[PDB]
Amino acid sequence: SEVAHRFKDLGEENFKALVLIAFAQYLQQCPFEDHVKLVNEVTEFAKTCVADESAENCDKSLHTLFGDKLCTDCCAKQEPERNECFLQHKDDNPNLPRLVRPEVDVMCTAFHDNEETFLKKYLYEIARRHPYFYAPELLFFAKRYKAAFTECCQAADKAACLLPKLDELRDEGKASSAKQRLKCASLQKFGERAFKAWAVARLSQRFPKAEFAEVSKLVTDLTKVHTECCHGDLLECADDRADLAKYICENQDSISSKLKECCEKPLLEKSHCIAEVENDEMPADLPSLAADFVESKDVCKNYAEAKDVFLGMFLYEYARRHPDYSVVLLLRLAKTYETTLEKCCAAADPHECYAKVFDEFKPLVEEPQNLIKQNCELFEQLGEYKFQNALLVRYTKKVPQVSTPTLVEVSRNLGKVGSKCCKHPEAKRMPCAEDYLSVVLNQLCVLHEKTPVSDRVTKCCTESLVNRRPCFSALEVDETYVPKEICTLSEKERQIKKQTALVELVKHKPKATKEQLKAVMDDFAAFVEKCCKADDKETCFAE
Ligand SMILES: [Pt+2]
Ligand SMILES: [Pt+2]
Protein backbone atom coordinates (compact mmCIF):
# COMPACT_ATOMS: atom_id res chain seq x y z
CA SER A 1 0.00 0.00 0.00
CA GLU A 2 0.96 3.66 -0.56
CA VAL A 3 -1.20 5.88 1.75
CA ALA A 4 0.57 4.24 4.72
CA HIS A 5 4.15 4.73 3.40
CA ARG A 6 3.31 8.48 3.32
CA PHE A 7 1.25 8.82 6.51
CA LYS A 8 4.30 7.19 8.23
CA ASP A 9 7.09 9.25 6.66
CA LEU A 10 5.17 12.56 6.89
CA GLY A 11 3.37 12.15 10.21
CA GLU A 12 -0.33 12.67 10.81
CA GLU A 13 0.00 16.41 11.42
CA ASN A 14 1.66 17.21 8.11
CA PHE A 15 -0.22 14.46 6.18
CA LYS A 16 -3.44 16.13 7.29
CA ALA A 17 -2.32 19.55 6.09
CA LEU A 18 -0.94 18.45 2.79
CA VAL A 19 -4.06 16.44 2.09
CA LEU A 20 -6.06 19.57 2.79
CA ILE A 21 -3.92 21.65 0.47
CA ALA A 22 -4.12 19.03 -2.28
CA PHE A 23 -7.90 19.32 -2.10
CA ALA A 24 -8.31 23.09 -1.71
CA GLN A 25 -5.99 23.60 -4.67
CA TYR A 26 -8.03 21.11 -6.76
CA LEU A 27 -11.46 22.54 -5.87
CA GLN A 28 -10.97 26.22 -5.01
CA GLN A 29 -14.64 27.23 -4.88
CA CYS A 30 -15.69 24.38 -2.52
CA PRO A 31 -16.35 25.61 1.11
CA PHE A 32 -13.98 25.06 4.04
CA GLU A 33 -15.95 22.62 6.20
CA ASP A 34 -16.73 20.65 2.99
CA HIS A 35 -13.01 19.87 2.61
CA VAL A 36 -12.23 19.17 6.26
CA LYS A 37 -14.69 16.25 6.24
CA LEU A 38 -12.97 14.74 3.17
CA VAL A 39 -9.63 15.29 4.85
CA ASN A 40 -10.65 13.58 8.10
CA GLU A 41 -12.20 10.62 6.25
CA VAL A 42 -8.99 10.14 4.23
CA THR A 43 -6.99 10.48 7.41
CA GLU A 44 -9.04 7.84 9.29
CA PHE A 45 -8.88 5.48 6.33
CA ALA A 46 -5.07 5.92 6.10
CA LYS A 47 -4.78 4.88 9.72
CA THR A 48 -6.68 1.68 8.96
CA CYS A 49 -4.08 0.93 6.24
CA VAL A 50 -1.31 1.68 8.81
CA ALA A 51 -2.82 -1.08 10.96
CA ASP A 52 -3.60 -3.46 8.02
CA GLU A 53 -1.38 -2.62 5.02
CA SER A 54 -3.45 -5.38 3.30
CA ALA A 55 -6.87 -3.91 4.33
CA GLU A 56 -9.60 -3.17 1.72
CA ASN A 57 -8.86 -0.37 -0.78
CA CYS A 58 -5.35 0.37 0.66
CA ASP A 59 -3.94 -1.19 -2.54
CA LYS A 60 -5.06 2.03 -4.42
CA SER A 61 -2.98 4.95 -5.73
CA LEU A 62 -3.33 8.27 -3.91
CA HIS A 63 -4.68 9.96 -7.04
CA THR A 64 -7.58 7.50 -7.18
CA LEU A 65 -8.36 7.91 -3.50
CA PHE A 66 -8.18 11.70 -3.59
CA GLY A 67 -10.02 12.08 -6.87
CA ASP A 68 -12.73 9.72 -5.54
CA LYS A 69 -13.25 11.51 -2.21
CA LEU A 70 -13.25 14.76 -4.12
CA CYS A 71 -15.89 13.41 -6.51
CA THR A 72 -18.26 12.78 -3.55
CA ASP A 73 -17.10 16.12 -16.29
CA CYS A 74 -13.79 15.32 -14.46
CA CYS A 75 -15.60 12.86 -12.21
CA ALA A 76 -17.11 11.16 -15.26
CA LYS A 77 -13.48 10.30 -16.07
CA GLN A 78 -10.89 7.93 -14.72
CA GLU A 79 -7.26 7.74 -13.89
CA PRO A 80 -5.17 9.16 -15.21
CA GLU A 81 -7.33 11.35 -17.52
CA ARG A 82 -9.38 12.34 -14.50
CA ASN A 83 -6.43 13.78 -12.53
CA GLU A 84 -5.13 15.67 -15.57
CA CYS A 85 -8.65 17.02 -15.68
CA PHE A 86 -8.40 18.56 -12.16
CA LEU A 87 -4.85 19.66 -12.86
CA GLN A 88 -6.12 21.58 -15.91
CA HIS A 89 -9.21 22.87 -14.07
CA LYS A 90 -6.90 24.85 -11.67
CA ASP A 91 -7.68 28.61 -11.68
CA ASP A 92 -4.81 31.11 -11.33
CA ASN A 93 -7.15 34.04 -10.81
CA PRO A 94 -10.34 32.93 -9.01
CA ASN A 95 -13.41 35.21 -8.67
CA LEU A 96 -12.89 34.49 -4.91
CA PRO A 97 -13.68 37.31 -2.44
CA ARG A 98 -10.90 39.72 -1.51
CA LEU A 99 -9.08 38.45 1.63
CA VAL A 100 -9.41 40.88 4.63
CA ARG A 101 -8.43 40.34 8.32
CA PRO A 102 -11.24 41.18 10.75
CA GLU A 103 -10.23 43.26 13.80
CA VAL A 104 -7.24 41.86 15.72
CA ASP A 105 -9.08 40.90 18.90
CA VAL A 106 -11.63 39.09 16.69
CA MET A 107 -8.90 36.85 15.28
CA CYS A 108 -7.19 36.52 18.73
CA THR A 109 -10.53 35.28 20.11
CA ALA A 110 -10.94 32.65 17.34
CA PHE A 111 -7.27 31.55 17.61
CA HIS A 112 -7.62 30.49 21.26
CA ASP A 113 -11.30 29.48 20.75
CA ASN A 114 -10.21 26.96 18.05
CA GLU A 115 -6.50 26.81 17.25
CA GLU A 116 -6.65 23.92 14.74
CA THR A 117 -9.68 25.00 12.68
CA PHE A 118 -7.94 28.38 12.65
CA LEU A 119 -4.69 27.12 10.93
CA LYS A 120 -6.58 24.79 8.62
CA LYS A 121 -8.59 27.99 7.77
CA TYR A 122 -5.29 29.73 6.77
CA LEU A 123 -3.90 26.85 4.71
CA TYR A 124 -7.35 26.57 3.07
CA GLU A 125 -7.67 30.25 2.23
CA ILE A 126 -4.11 30.50 0.79
CA ALA A 127 -4.16 27.19 -1.09
CA ARG A 128 -7.37 27.92 -3.05
CA ARG A 129 -5.89 31.32 -4.07
CA HIS A 130 -2.44 29.94 -4.97
CA PRO A 131 -3.22 26.62 -6.62
CA TYR A 132 0.43 26.21 -7.57
CA PHE A 133 1.84 27.17 -4.12
CA TYR A 134 4.81 25.01 -3.03
CA ALA A 135 2.99 22.72 -0.56
CA PRO A 136 5.96 21.89 1.77
CA GLU A 137 6.77 25.64 2.08
CA LEU A 138 3.15 26.42 2.76
CA LEU A 139 3.67 24.32 5.93
CA PHE A 140 6.69 26.46 6.92
CA PHE A 141 4.46 29.45 6.31
CA ALA A 142 1.68 27.91 8.46
CA LYS A 143 4.00 27.21 11.44
CA ARG A 144 5.36 30.77 11.27
CA TYR A 145 1.70 31.88 11.02
CA LYS A 146 0.93 29.96 14.25
CA ALA A 147 4.08 31.34 15.99
CA ALA A 148 2.75 34.91 15.59
CA PHE A 149 -0.71 34.17 16.99
CA THR A 150 0.91 32.28 19.89
CA GLU A 151 3.06 35.35 20.83
CA CYS A 152 1.05 38.41 19.68
CA CYS A 153 -2.33 37.19 21.05
CA GLN A 154 -0.44 37.44 24.32
CA ALA A 155 1.08 40.93 24.73
CA ALA A 156 0.17 44.54 25.56
CA ASP A 157 -0.35 45.65 21.98
CA LYS A 158 -1.57 42.87 19.75
CA ALA A 159 -2.02 45.06 16.64
CA ALA A 160 1.59 46.43 16.74
CA CYS A 161 2.88 42.90 17.25
CA LEU A 162 0.76 40.55 15.10
CA LEU A 163 -0.21 42.66 12.02
CA PRO A 164 3.44 43.63 11.20
CA LYS A 165 4.33 39.90 10.95
CA LEU A 166 1.26 39.14 8.86
CA ASP A 167 2.23 41.93 6.42
CA GLU A 168 5.59 40.17 6.14
CA LEU A 169 4.03 36.74 5.63
CA ARG A 170 1.58 37.95 2.91
CA ASP A 171 4.49 39.57 1.06
CA GLU A 172 6.74 36.46 1.44
CA GLY A 173 3.92 34.04 0.44
CA LYS A 174 3.13 36.12 -2.65
CA ALA A 175 6.81 35.87 -3.73
CA SER A 176 7.12 32.13 -2.98
CA SER A 177 3.86 31.39 -4.86
CA ALA A 178 4.92 33.41 -7.91
CA LYS A 179 8.41 31.83 -7.87
CA GLN A 180 6.87 28.34 -7.69
CA ARG A 181 4.37 29.09 -10.45
CA LEU A 182 7.44 29.71 -12.74
CA LYS A 183 8.82 26.33 -11.81
CA CYS A 184 5.50 24.66 -12.60
CA ALA A 185 4.98 26.50 -15.95
CA SER A 186 8.61 25.74 -16.98
CA LEU A 187 7.88 22.02 -16.42
CA GLN A 188 4.38 21.83 -17.84
CA LYS A 189 4.72 24.13 -20.82
CA PHE A 190 8.46 23.55 -21.65
CA GLY A 191 9.04 19.98 -20.33
CA GLU A 192 11.65 18.60 -17.94
CA ARG A 193 14.64 18.89 -20.30
CA ALA A 194 14.19 22.64 -19.83
CA PHE A 195 13.78 22.73 -16.05
CA LYS A 196 16.83 20.53 -15.73
CA ALA A 197 18.93 23.20 -17.49
CA TRP A 198 17.48 25.84 -15.15
CA ALA A 199 18.34 23.84 -12.09
CA VAL A 200 21.81 22.94 -13.42
CA ALA A 201 22.32 26.67 -13.90
CA ARG A 202 21.03 27.78 -10.49
CA LEU A 203 22.55 25.04 -8.35
CA SER A 204 25.94 25.36 -10.09
CA GLN A 205 25.66 28.96 -8.90
CA ARG A 206 24.62 28.08 -5.29
CA PHE A 207 27.26 25.25 -5.11
CA PRO A 208 30.32 26.15 -7.26
CA LYS A 209 32.66 23.74 -5.44
CA ALA A 210 30.46 20.75 -6.27
CA GLU A 211 31.68 18.28 -8.95
CA PHE A 212 29.27 18.07 -11.93
CA ALA A 213 28.35 14.49 -10.93
CA GLU A 214 26.84 15.81 -7.63
CA VAL A 215 24.99 18.71 -9.23
CA SER A 216 23.47 16.31 -11.79
CA LYS A 217 22.20 14.19 -8.93
CA LEU A 218 20.80 17.18 -7.08
CA VAL A 219 19.13 18.40 -10.24
CA THR A 220 17.55 14.96 -10.78
CA ASP A 221 16.14 14.79 -7.26
CA LEU A 222 14.96 18.38 -7.25
CA THR A 223 13.33 17.97 -10.68
CA LYS A 224 11.53 14.93 -9.23
CA VAL A 225 10.47 16.99 -6.17
CA HIS A 226 8.99 19.79 -8.31
CA THR A 227 7.50 17.63 -11.07
CA GLU A 228 5.40 16.04 -8.33
CA CYS A 229 4.37 19.26 -6.50
CA CYS A 230 3.25 20.67 -9.87
CA HIS A 231 1.53 17.49 -10.97
CA GLY A 232 -0.33 17.61 -7.62
CA ASP A 233 1.54 14.76 -5.95
CA LEU A 234 2.09 16.89 -2.87
CA LEU A 235 2.50 14.15 -0.30
CA GLU A 236 5.28 12.52 -2.26
CA CYS A 237 6.58 16.01 -3.13
CA ALA A 238 7.11 16.84 0.57
CA ASP A 239 8.61 13.45 1.45
CA ASP A 240 11.00 13.56 -1.47
CA ARG A 241 11.88 17.18 -0.50
CA ALA A 242 12.64 15.98 3.04
CA ASP A 243 14.73 13.05 1.81
CA LEU A 244 16.61 15.58 -0.37
CA ALA A 245 17.16 18.01 2.48
CA LYS A 246 18.46 15.05 4.50
CA TYR A 247 20.72 13.97 1.66
CA ILE A 248 22.24 17.41 1.13
CA CYS A 249 23.15 17.83 4.80
CA GLU A 250 24.87 14.43 5.17
CA ASN A 251 27.16 15.21 2.26
CA GLN A 252 27.51 18.97 3.06
CA ASP A 253 31.35 19.02 2.78
CA SER A 254 31.12 18.14 -0.95
CA ILE A 255 28.40 20.77 -1.69
CA SER A 256 28.80 24.08 0.16
CA SER A 257 30.42 25.72 3.19
CA LYS A 258 27.28 27.75 3.78
CA LEU A 259 24.87 24.94 4.68
CA LYS A 260 25.97 24.42 8.38
CA GLU A 261 23.51 26.90 9.92
CA CYS A 262 20.70 25.59 7.69
CA CYS A 263 21.45 21.84 8.33
CA GLU A 264 21.30 22.31 12.11
CA LYS A 265 17.56 23.21 12.15
CA PRO A 266 14.17 21.36 12.01
CA LEU A 267 12.74 19.57 9.05
CA LEU A 268 10.66 22.47 7.78
CA GLU A 269 13.14 25.28 8.56
CA LYS A 270 16.08 23.60 6.92
CA SER A 271 14.32 22.83 3.60
CA HIS A 272 13.52 26.55 3.29
CA CYS A 273 16.89 27.67 4.64
CA ILE A 274 18.68 25.48 2.05
CA ALA A 275 16.41 26.67 -0.73
CA GLU A 276 17.42 30.21 0.25
CA VAL A 277 21.21 29.80 0.99
CA GLU A 278 23.83 32.25 -0.29
CA ASN A 279 26.14 31.22 -3.15
CA ASP A 280 29.31 29.44 -1.99
CA GLU A 281 32.65 31.26 -2.47
CA MET A 282 34.04 31.11 -6.14
CA PRO A 283 36.81 28.42 -6.28
CA ALA A 284 40.34 29.67 -6.91
CA ASP A 285 42.14 28.59 -10.08
CA LEU A 286 39.59 27.15 -12.48
CA PRO A 287 40.96 26.43 -15.94
CA SER A 288 39.44 28.93 -18.40
CA LEU A 289 36.48 27.44 -20.26
CA ALA A 290 37.82 28.01 -23.80
CA ALA A 291 40.40 25.20 -23.37
CA ASP A 292 37.79 22.42 -23.25
CA PHE A 293 34.90 24.08 -25.11
CA VAL A 294 36.68 26.04 -27.95
CA GLU A 295 40.41 25.18 -28.24
CA SER A 296 39.83 21.40 -27.73
CA LYS A 297 40.03 19.13 -30.79
CA ASP A 298 37.26 16.90 -29.30
CA VAL A 299 34.42 19.45 -29.08
CA CYS A 300 32.78 18.21 -32.27
CA LYS A 301 33.41 14.64 -30.97
CA ASN A 302 32.01 15.00 -27.44
CA TYR A 303 28.96 16.91 -28.82
CA ALA A 304 28.30 13.81 -30.91
CA GLU A 305 29.13 11.13 -28.34
CA ALA A 306 27.10 12.91 -25.59
CA LYS A 307 25.56 16.32 -26.47
CA ASP A 308 23.57 16.40 -23.20
CA VAL A 309 26.44 15.49 -20.85
CA PHE A 310 28.74 17.80 -22.76
CA LEU A 311 26.43 20.82 -22.92
CA GLY A 312 25.67 20.10 -19.23
CA MET A 313 29.32 19.96 -18.32
CA PHE A 314 29.45 23.31 -20.17
CA LEU A 315 26.41 24.96 -18.50
CA TYR A 316 27.79 23.77 -15.20
CA GLU A 317 31.30 25.06 -15.89
CA TYR A 318 30.07 28.49 -17.09
CA ALA A 319 27.38 28.89 -14.40
CA ARG A 320 29.79 28.03 -11.53
CA ARG A 321 32.08 30.92 -12.55
CA HIS A 322 29.25 33.37 -13.25
CA PRO A 323 27.17 34.14 -10.12
CA ASP A 324 27.01 37.63 -11.67
CA TYR A 325 24.85 36.40 -14.60
CA SER A 326 21.16 35.62 -14.56
CA VAL A 327 20.11 31.99 -15.07
CA VAL A 328 18.08 32.99 -18.17
CA LEU A 329 21.20 34.61 -19.65
CA LEU A 330 23.26 31.49 -18.94
CA LEU A 331 20.63 29.37 -20.58
CA ARG A 332 20.65 31.69 -23.66
CA LEU A 333 24.42 31.43 -23.86
CA ALA A 334 24.07 27.68 -23.54
CA LYS A 335 21.55 27.71 -26.40
CA THR A 336 23.78 29.92 -28.57
CA TYR A 337 26.65 27.51 -27.84
CA GLU A 338 24.56 24.40 -28.73
CA THR A 339 23.27 26.18 -31.85
CA THR A 340 26.76 27.15 -33.01
CA LEU A 341 28.22 23.71 -32.36
CA GLU A 342 25.38 22.34 -34.48
CA LYS A 343 26.24 24.54 -37.51
CA CYS A 344 30.01 24.38 -37.07
CA CYS A 345 30.43 20.61 -36.62
CA ALA A 346 28.70 20.33 -40.03
CA ALA A 347 31.43 22.43 -41.72
CA ALA A 348 34.74 21.93 -43.63
CA ASP A 349 36.96 22.92 -40.63
CA PRO A 350 34.76 23.08 -37.50
CA HIS A 351 37.59 24.22 -35.22
CA GLU A 352 37.50 27.41 -37.34
CA CYS A 353 33.74 27.72 -37.54
CA TYR A 354 33.07 27.63 -33.77
CA ALA A 355 36.40 29.21 -32.66
CA LYS A 356 34.75 32.64 -32.17
CA VAL A 357 31.60 31.38 -30.37
CA PHE A 358 32.40 33.59 -27.31
CA ASP A 359 32.19 36.76 -29.43
CA GLU A 360 28.53 35.84 -29.85
CA PHE A 361 28.14 36.16 -26.08
CA LYS A 362 29.17 39.85 -25.64
CA PRO A 363 25.85 41.05 -27.13
CA LEU A 364 23.72 38.60 -25.07
CA VAL A 365 25.59 39.60 -21.94
CA GLU A 366 25.49 43.39 -22.58
CA GLU A 367 21.84 43.72 -23.61
CA PRO A 368 20.82 42.91 -19.97
CA GLN A 369 23.59 44.92 -18.24
CA ASN A 370 22.63 48.13 -20.01
CA LEU A 371 18.89 47.74 -19.40
CA ILE A 372 19.49 47.28 -15.67
CA LYS A 373 21.98 50.16 -15.33
CA GLN A 374 19.41 52.38 -16.97
CA ASN A 375 16.18 51.60 -15.07
CA CYS A 376 18.20 51.57 -11.80
CA GLU A 377 19.37 55.08 -12.64
CA LEU A 378 15.67 55.68 -13.36
CA PHE A 379 14.43 54.01 -10.20
CA GLU A 380 16.66 56.07 -7.90
CA GLN A 381 15.65 59.12 -9.99
CA LEU A 382 11.85 58.49 -9.42
CA GLY A 383 11.22 56.29 -6.35
CA GLU A 384 9.12 53.10 -6.41
CA TYR A 385 5.51 54.39 -6.81
CA LYS A 386 6.28 56.89 -9.59
CA PHE A 387 8.65 54.26 -11.04
CA GLN A 388 5.64 51.85 -11.27
CA ASN A 389 3.70 54.37 -13.39
CA ALA A 390 6.44 54.62 -16.01
CA LEU A 391 6.43 50.80 -16.41
CA LEU A 392 2.63 50.86 -16.31
CA VAL A 393 2.53 53.36 -19.19
CA ARG A 394 5.43 51.74 -21.10
CA TYR A 395 3.72 48.34 -20.99
CA THR A 396 0.11 49.45 -21.39
CA LYS A 397 1.17 50.91 -24.78
CA LYS A 398 3.06 47.72 -25.67
CA VAL A 399 -0.08 45.60 -24.95
CA PRO A 400 -3.14 47.86 -24.70
CA GLN A 401 -5.27 44.75 -25.21
CA VAL A 402 -4.43 43.31 -21.73
CA SER A 403 -6.98 43.70 -18.90
CA THR A 404 -6.46 46.70 -16.66
CA PRO A 405 -6.26 44.71 -13.35
CA THR A 406 -3.56 42.53 -14.84
CA LEU A 407 -1.75 45.51 -16.27
CA VAL A 408 -1.75 47.24 -12.88
CA GLU A 409 -0.88 44.08 -10.97
CA VAL A 410 2.01 43.22 -13.28
CA SER A 411 3.33 46.76 -13.70
CA ARG A 412 3.42 47.25 -9.93
CA ASN A 413 5.42 44.03 -9.54
CA LEU A 414 7.79 45.02 -12.28
CA GLY A 415 8.11 48.17 -10.13
CA LYS A 416 9.52 46.35 -7.10
CA VAL A 417 12.55 45.18 -9.09
CA GLY A 418 13.98 48.61 -8.42
CA SER A 419 13.69 48.58 -4.67
CA LYS A 420 14.46 44.83 -4.46
CA CYS A 421 17.65 44.88 -6.51
CA CYS A 422 18.99 48.34 -7.38
CA LYS A 423 20.52 48.63 -3.81
CA HIS A 424 22.90 45.75 -4.56
CA PRO A 425 26.32 46.23 -6.28
CA GLU A 426 26.36 45.61 -10.08
CA ALA A 427 27.90 42.14 -9.35
CA LYS A 428 24.62 40.98 -7.75
CA ARG A 429 22.12 43.13 -9.72
CA MET A 430 21.33 41.16 -12.96
CA PRO A 431 20.64 37.74 -11.35
CA CYS A 432 18.47 39.68 -8.86
CA ALA A 433 16.61 41.72 -11.47
CA GLU A 434 16.33 39.67 -14.59
CA ASP A 435 15.35 36.43 -12.80
CA TYR A 436 12.75 38.33 -10.73
CA LEU A 437 11.43 39.85 -13.94
CA SER A 438 11.24 36.34 -15.33
CA VAL A 439 8.84 35.46 -12.49
CA VAL A 440 6.67 38.60 -12.86
CA LEU A 441 6.50 38.15 -16.63
CA ASN A 442 5.35 34.60 -16.01
CA GLN A 443 2.42 36.01 -13.85
CA LEU A 444 1.49 38.05 -16.88
CA CYS A 445 1.87 35.04 -19.11
CA VAL A 446 -0.44 32.86 -17.01
CA LEU A 447 -3.02 35.51 -16.13
CA HIS A 448 -3.09 36.11 -19.87
CA GLU A 449 -3.21 32.43 -20.72
CA LYS A 450 -6.56 32.25 -18.87
CA THR A 451 -8.33 34.74 -21.16
CA PRO A 452 -6.18 35.51 -24.18
CA VAL A 453 -6.43 38.91 -25.97
CA SER A 454 -2.98 39.86 -27.44
CA ASP A 455 -1.15 37.71 -30.01
CA ARG A 456 2.07 39.59 -29.04
CA VAL A 457 1.95 38.56 -25.34
CA THR A 458 1.13 35.03 -26.39
CA LYS A 459 3.99 34.96 -28.93
CA CYS A 460 6.46 36.11 -26.24
CA CYS A 461 5.03 33.77 -23.60
CA THR A 462 4.91 30.54 -25.67
CA GLU A 463 7.90 31.07 -28.05
CA SER A 464 10.73 30.58 -25.56
CA LEU A 465 10.81 30.56 -21.81
CA VAL A 466 14.30 31.94 -21.69
CA ASN A 467 13.91 34.93 -24.12
CA ARG A 468 10.64 36.34 -22.66
CA ARG A 469 12.23 39.40 -21.00
CA PRO A 470 14.03 40.41 -24.24
CA CYS A 471 10.87 39.60 -26.21
CA PHE A 472 8.82 41.94 -24.05
CA SER A 473 11.48 44.58 -23.66
CA ALA A 474 11.78 44.53 -27.50
CA LEU A 475 8.12 45.38 -28.07
CA GLU A 476 7.36 48.82 -29.48
CA VAL A 477 4.00 50.54 -28.85
CA ASP A 478 1.08 48.77 -30.55
CA GLU A 479 -0.01 50.85 -33.61
CA THR A 480 -2.88 48.49 -34.57
CA TYR A 481 -4.67 49.30 -31.28
CA VAL A 482 -7.87 51.33 -31.63
CA PRO A 483 -8.11 53.85 -28.71
CA LYS A 484 -10.61 53.06 -25.96
CA GLU A 485 -13.81 55.16 -26.14
CA ILE A 486 -12.47 56.13 -1.81
CA CYS A 487 -11.09 59.11 0.20
CA THR A 488 -10.72 56.93 3.28
CA LEU A 489 -8.15 54.64 1.62
CA SER A 490 -4.64 53.61 2.61
CA GLU A 491 -1.70 54.93 0.57
CA LYS A 492 -1.23 51.57 -1.17
CA GLU A 493 -4.97 51.64 -1.87
CA ARG A 494 -5.04 55.20 -3.33
CA GLN A 495 -2.03 54.17 -5.43
CA ILE A 496 -3.85 51.23 -7.05
CA LYS A 497 -6.81 53.44 -8.02
CA LYS A 498 -4.70 56.25 -9.34
CA GLN A 499 -2.73 53.62 -11.36
CA THR A 500 -5.86 51.82 -12.56
CA ALA A 501 -7.12 55.18 -13.81
CA LEU A 502 -3.70 55.83 -15.43
CA VAL A 503 -4.08 52.67 -17.52
CA GLU A 504 -7.52 53.75 -18.76
CA LEU A 505 -6.11 57.17 -19.41
CA VAL A 506 -3.40 55.59 -21.66
CA LYS A 507 -5.83 53.16 -23.31
CA HIS A 508 -7.82 56.35 -24.16
CA LYS A 509 -5.17 58.37 -26.09
CA PRO A 510 -2.18 55.99 -26.64
CA LYS A 511 -0.43 58.70 -28.72
CA ALA A 512 -0.23 60.77 -25.49
CA THR A 513 2.73 62.93 -24.50
CA LYS A 514 4.18 62.59 -21.01
CA GLU A 515 3.21 66.33 -20.55
CA GLN A 516 -0.45 65.98 -21.74
CA LEU A 517 -0.52 62.97 -19.37
CA LYS A 518 0.95 64.96 -16.48
CA ALA A 519 -1.86 67.40 -17.31
CA VAL A 520 -4.70 64.83 -17.25
CA MET A 521 -3.29 62.83 -14.29
CA ASP A 522 -2.96 66.02 -12.23
CA ASP A 523 -6.42 67.32 -13.24
CA PHE A 524 -8.01 64.11 -12.01
CA ALA A 525 -5.99 63.87 -8.77
CA ALA A 526 -7.08 67.45 -8.06
CA PHE A 527 -10.68 66.39 -8.85
CA VAL A 528 -10.57 63.54 -6.33
CA GLU A 529 -8.76 65.84 -3.82
CA LYS A 530 -11.53 68.45 -4.01
CA CYS A 531 -14.36 65.88 -4.12
CA CYS A 532 -12.81 64.38 -0.93
CA LYS A 533 -13.02 67.75 0.96
CA ALA A 534 -16.82 67.11 1.22
CA ASP A 535 -20.43 68.50 1.09
CA ASP A 536 -22.62 65.81 -0.61
CA LYS A 537 -19.44 64.18 -2.10
CA GLU A 538 -21.42 62.04 -4.65
CA THR A 539 -23.01 65.35 -5.94
CA CYS A 540 -19.34 66.56 -6.34
CA PHE A 541 -18.29 63.27 -8.11
CA ALA A 542 -20.98 64.21 -10.68
CA GLU A 543 -18.52 64.14 -13.69
PT1 LIG B 1 -2.60 35.94 -1.99
PT1 LIG C 1 33.43 17.84 -18.48
Numbering used by the authors: 5 to 76, 89 to 501, 513 to 570
Anything the authors wrote about it?
Here we investigated cytotoxicity and DNA and protein binding of an iodido analog of picoplatin, the cis-ammine-diiodido(2-methylpyridine)platinum(II) complex (I-picoplatin). Protein platination affects drug bioavailability and toxicity and plays an important role in the mechanism of action of anticancer Pt complexes. Its reactivity with lysozyme (HEWL) and pancreatic RNase A was studied by X-ray diffraction and mass spectrometry experiments.
Here, we have studied the reactivity of HSA with I-picoplatin, solving two low-resolution structures of the I-picoplatin/HSA adduct. The HSA structure in its adduct with I-picoplatin has been refined to a resolution of 3.9 Å. The final model, which lacks four residues at the N-terminal tail, residues of loops 76–89 and 501–513 and a few residues at the C-terminal tail, refines to a crystallographic R-factor of 0.293 (Rfree = 0.327). The platinated HSA structure is almost identical to that in the absence of the metal compound: the protein retains its heart-shape due to the assembly of three helical domains (labeled I–III), each of which is divided into two subdomains (A and B) and to the presence of 17 disulfide bridges. Although the structure has been determined at low resolution, it shows unambiguous evidence of Pt binding sites. A total of three Pt binding sites were clearly identified in the Fourier difference and anomalous difference e. d. maps. Pt is found close to the side chains of His146, Met298, and Met329. Met298 and Met329 are cisplatin binding sites both in the absence and presence of fatty acids, while His146 was believed to be a cisplatin binding site only in the presence of fatty acids up to now. Although solved at low resolution, the new structure of platinated HSA clearly shows that the metal compound binds the side chains of His146, Met298, and Met329, suggesting that the compound reacts differently with the protein compared to cisplatin.
